[PDB]
């Protein structure tokens, strides 16, 4: 848990279901989405 300052980060197991993640990130945090964009890059150093 906890903030980062130089945002809210989190260490998480891969085996959790996505619904508790979404309920966390919408209820305890900011609101819903009319849209959702995905960019894939990260092998590009």
Q: What is the largest CA-CA distance in the chain?
A: 35
Length of the chain: 45
Instruction: Give the Cα separation of 37 and 21 in Å (integer).
Output: 18
User: How far apart, in Å, do the first and last CA atoms of the chain sit?
Assistant: 28
Residue with tokens 């980060």: 9
Instruction: Give the Cα separation of 44 and 20 in Å (integer).
Output: 31
Nearest to 10, CA basis, from 37, 28, 31: 28
For residues 9 and 2, the answer to whether their CB atoms sit within 8 Å is yes
Instruction: Give the Cα separation of 2 and 14 in Å (integer).
Output: 19
Instruction: Give the Cα separation of 16 and 10 in Å (integer).
Output: 13
Structure tokens at 44: 């590009």
For residues 32 and 38, the answer to whether their CB atoms sit within 8 Å is no
């Amino acid at each position: 848990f906890g903030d980062i300052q130089f945002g809210k980060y989190l260490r998480l197991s891969c085996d959790t279901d996505s619904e508790t993640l979404y309920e966390l990130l919408t209820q305890h945090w900011h609101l819903k989405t009319p849209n959702l964009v995905i960019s894939v890059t990260g092998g590009a150093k």
